A paper describes a structure:
CA folds into two distinct domains connected by a linker: the N-terminal domain (CANTD), composed of seven α-helices and a single β-hairpin, and the C-terminal domain (CACTD), composed of a 310-helix and four α-helices. The cores comprise ~250 CA hexamers and 12 CA pentamers.
The second-site mutation, R132T, located in helix α7 near E45A, partially restores extended water-mediated interactions impaired by E45A. Additionally, there is a decrease with respect to WT, in the IA at the intra- and inter-hexamer interfaces. Notably, the altered α9_hex1–α9_hex2 inter-hexamer conformation in E45Aa with respect to other CA proteins is restored to WT-like interactions in E45A/R132T. In turn, the R132T secondary mutation in E45A/R132T appears to restore the local structure to WT-like conformation, likely enabling unfettered access to the PF74/CPSF6/Nup153 pocket. As in P38A/T216I, R132T, reverts the E45A assembly morphology to that of WT CA long tubes. Addition of R132T resulted in a decreased stability for the E45A/R132T cores, albeit still higher than that of WT, especially at later time points. For E45A/R132T CA, there is a loss in stability (Tm = 124.6 °C).
Author numbering:
A (entry chain A), B (entry chain A), C (entry chain A), D (entry chain A), E (entry chain A), F (entry chain A): 1 to 4, 10 to 221
The structure:
């Protein structure tokens, strides 16, 4: 990675942390923030290290590769490289495969990241990776938000935990998520809780909803 | 985080420590001081990393989101942003969502935290998070302080441990807590201890109370 | 903490070390030196972090709070704060609650600790905490030094281990401890060892006493 | 290793990480990226340390030695050393065995790596090692890509995981790998999935293929 | 400790390492080199931290205290402190209890250790501690070197391991140790090995002795 | 150790790593590269720390002592110390026991290692230690290379693993090792493999030999 500047290897602990996270949690949604934290200041070389150290899950890892290549091709369309000899005190313009670290060297990556103005190839590549990880989380989610229904003796808190877990795995925008919360949460609550939540009105906070259905 | 200045990634150990704390202790009151210690010098990006790495407990995490948004909206009311182009050698004034790290970049966060005078967005956001965590601790507390009663063969020390554990989870002010201690502790002690503690008078320290009921 | 100067967060390992020490050893006497080592260079904020991260033992932790408040009130009596506006290039004089970190900020704590001359608020607060921890160790000690008696088939080394373990938990001064050693150790040894130790005379070292009763 | 410059020992954690990786994963393909990450900035001395700390697998380790010697001999052919006394402020030209660290000293390795222009002997030797590791991965792969066939009740995702795991161990070029994907994946799918994938046409992404055969 | 200069706290890992060593190995001879390594650059405060963090073994720890006090009293005899006010840019001369860290402050310890010329109070105190630890190792050794005799079917290597383990715990000088090796090792070997070793003559190395009795 | 310069203590992790390596692997050949890596930049004091922290194996550790003394005596013969007072800005010439760290101080060791020109006493002593460790590995090897014979149903890969494991423990030169490989490997293979390997001719690589006998 790079930190406030200087380059260094990914630490053994960071490497092991990532490998173990994937071994333990597969593609539960919280893996993505963990990936992002473990890859802080990463060069594309470091990001490829992290992805290539995953054994198994090779369908997911292939899907990620295809997503990356799609984003790289889009970058190339928007940023076509201009022909000419690179001047003294200048860097060549990166293509998509340079950002993804397959056709660039570490020095070139360092060159772009530490240039003035900077070309943050590590952060660009990370956005592409996270887009691909989000697709995998979606695909690997066992359940739909439409099927989350409170059981007749289920504590409301447990139902809400299942609701918001499933909502998190959905790849719908924030406005759609708001509609899901406003509509389904109360609609798919059990008869007694549902009646109590409708009495609160559509202005209630989750805290107030949870407090209301505690006794039920 | 930032430390005496320079920015760096949250360490794998810090990340793992937080994840494991939540896995093991859920929302026992001591989790909050642990959160605060693990988030020392944190930018809002780092604070979101910590909260987003939690898998499960998504009712609690949603309640926390709602608390954050409430505090952000209050900030916006008290600190309305003034229209105009930002001068050379100046930072734009942060709105609530900039403090909570959803509409600001890391450089902007670094910019505010290291400015002269500083705008400590990390510490402001942390106060909002801790307010939300305190609400969750309250809500998830199984017991009321009014129901803590010493058993007829219960060592006074064990009763006092249960009393002060339950008191800690109550979200009443320090003056109310003082009344609880002065009134209930002795009132809800078992017959023999209760008689002995009333004989000490209302000036006794906890040490003296504990020593008095040792033999009982 | 602060180290030779610069401030930084308490490390996750330090935090975990302290939590685990308390989980494992409760209030055995060796916990106090461990506390002191783990809190080296600590600000009052860091010291409160350490104490607040303890879950359970809330009778002990309340006793500690009361001890701290007693020491803070004594500080206030000896060091009454003088009214007036604080000059440029000067620090306000700390009251007891500033030393204990409940009414002071981290910058103010840093301000006092790094001032010339220094006001070591962290070390002052640590002495108060250790006074309180010593009271808890005393109170939680199961045994009195007067009751430590060598069994008729007990190796002298095992008896001496029990003697000095119990002596360590007593909160009597060094002169009283010397009397206990000079008087009780030999007095409460078993018949055969006791006779052998009285023959050595009152000038014998512990090494010589232990060697003498090896064969017994 | 060397990091942005300064030399230092390989850390105990790096050493242990490598030893344990080999103990646990043998020569699964992901071991190679792990080797590369753990050997970041390595001198040839450090690389030999890593390889020599492996106990067991001595057939593989001998094959690696032979691969290294082959690459060293090729280097010598392409870069024959010129006779003459080495000038003040100059380094002798490295032969293959100097790059592999058997006839050079640590200072000489440091000398080449930190020279202007640099002669990155660590990175050259690492390419040779990885060539040898790739040969071992190939040789130790239990299965051929031609034999990966979806079972009649096998989830398509599981079949794809096995396909891309086996493909990764093949030491065929990227163009051959593309042919394998375009031809075999669909060809060796089970009757019902195979029919569904042929209906998608040869433009489908893996995501689309996986989604199509979810219900099957 | 102090390292090339700057002071810092003993690390949690160092603390834990020492505690665990004592828990696991008690007073086997190798504990002393481990103590010495873990206490590298230690101030007397750090050395007391290490000794005071030991729970149990309080007979041994008391014997150590008595040994320390004996060495402190000897220091005082050889180095009597001269009366007078300490000059600007000068340090007071340490007494035995200042070296052992009970009557000196950390700053004073730092003062002596970093003075020109240095007064290495940490290293002086460490020699006293190691003298005391050696006495404990001796006292706690279960066996005498005179009783180590090779069994009639015991591999010579196992006998030699027991011999040199027991020899290490003896607190006799190097010349006495040489006599023990030259005399007893061969004398207390089993009949067949003993005959073979006497045939080698008194010039044989241990390697040659071990090789000679391999087949036996 | 010393690192690019500055001196510091051996880390607790390094110490523990070495102790555990010896506990787990005894004197398997890979222990020596591990020793060398863990002792990088070591002073003789640090090297003695590492050797003295070993509990048990005291026959081996005595053999190592004798090997060290032999090398020290050889050093003394080749480098006799010249009588005279040591000049300002000069170091006394080290004798063998100064190199082995028994008659020199840490400052003197630092003095030699950081002098211009340097006298690398740590690296010299390390060569002596490794010579002694190699003697122990030889002596403790259970098997001879002449006795490694492929079983009639043994996979060739398993036979080759045993061959090269045993070869590694032999203390014969590289030319002798080459003869062993060229002669014995094929000679001591099982009837069917042996016939197949003789058909390849004496130019075959190990990879080619292993591939040839895969089906057998
Ligand atoms: Cl995995
Ligand atoms: Cl998953
Ligand atoms: Cl890679
Ligand atoms: Cl790869
Ligand atoms: Cl850009
Ligand atoms: Cl970047
Ligand atoms: Cl569900
Ligand atoms: Cl969780
Ligand atoms: Cl909870
Ligand atoms: Cl995040
Ligand atoms: Cl998230
Ligand atoms: Cl502000
Ligand atoms: Cl802040
Ligand atoms: Cl309770
Ligand atoms: Cl606890
Ligand atoms: Cl206790
Ligand atoms: Cl706190
Ligand atoms: Cl708290
Ligand atoms: Cl003061
Ligand atoms: Cl302080
Ligand atoms: Cl007892
Ligand atoms: Cl292995
Ligand atoms: Cl393998
Ligand atoms: Cl090596
Ligand atoms: Cl080797
Ligand atoms: Cl080159
Ligand atoms: Cl290199
Ligand atoms: Cl398969
Ligand atoms: Cl212990
Ligand atoms: Cl012992
Ligand atoms: Cl202490
Ligand atoms: Cl103590
Ligand atoms: Cl001195
Ligand atoms: Cl010192
Ligand atoms: Cl024995
Ligand atoms: Cl051992
Ligand atoms: Cl062995
Ligand atoms: Cl030592
Ligand atoms: Cl030793
Ligand atoms: Cl030399
Ligand atoms: Cl050296
Ligand atoms: Cl074998």
């Amino acid at each position: 990675p790079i930190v406030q500047m200087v380059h260094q290897a990914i630490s053994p602990r960071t490497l092991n942390a990532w490998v173990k996270v994937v071994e333990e949690k597969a593609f539960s949604p919280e893996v993505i923030p963990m990936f992002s934290a473990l890859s802080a200041g990463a060069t594309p070389q470091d990001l490829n290290t992290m992805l290539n150290t995953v054994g198994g899950h090779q369908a997911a890892m292939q899907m990620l590769k295809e997503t990356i290549n799609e984003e790289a091709a889009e970058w190339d369309r928007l940023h076509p490289v201009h022909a000419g000899p690179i001047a003294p005190g200048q860097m060549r313009e990166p293509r998509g495969s340079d950002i993804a670290g397959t056709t660039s060297t570490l020095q070139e990556q360092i060159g772009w990241m530490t240039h003035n103005p900077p070309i943050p190839v590590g952060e660009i590549y990370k956005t592409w990776i996270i887009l691909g990880l989000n697709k995998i989380v979606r695909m690997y989610s066992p359940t739909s938000i439409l099927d989350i229904r409170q059981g007749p003796k289920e504590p409301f808190r447990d139902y809400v935990d299942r609701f918001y877990k499933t909502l998190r795995a959905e790849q719908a925008s924030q406005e759609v998520k708001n509609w899901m919360t406003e509509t389904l949460l109360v609609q798919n609550a059990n008869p007694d809780c549902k009646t109590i939540l409708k009495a609160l009105g559509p202005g209630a906070t989750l805290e107030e909803m949870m407090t209301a259905c505690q006794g039920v």
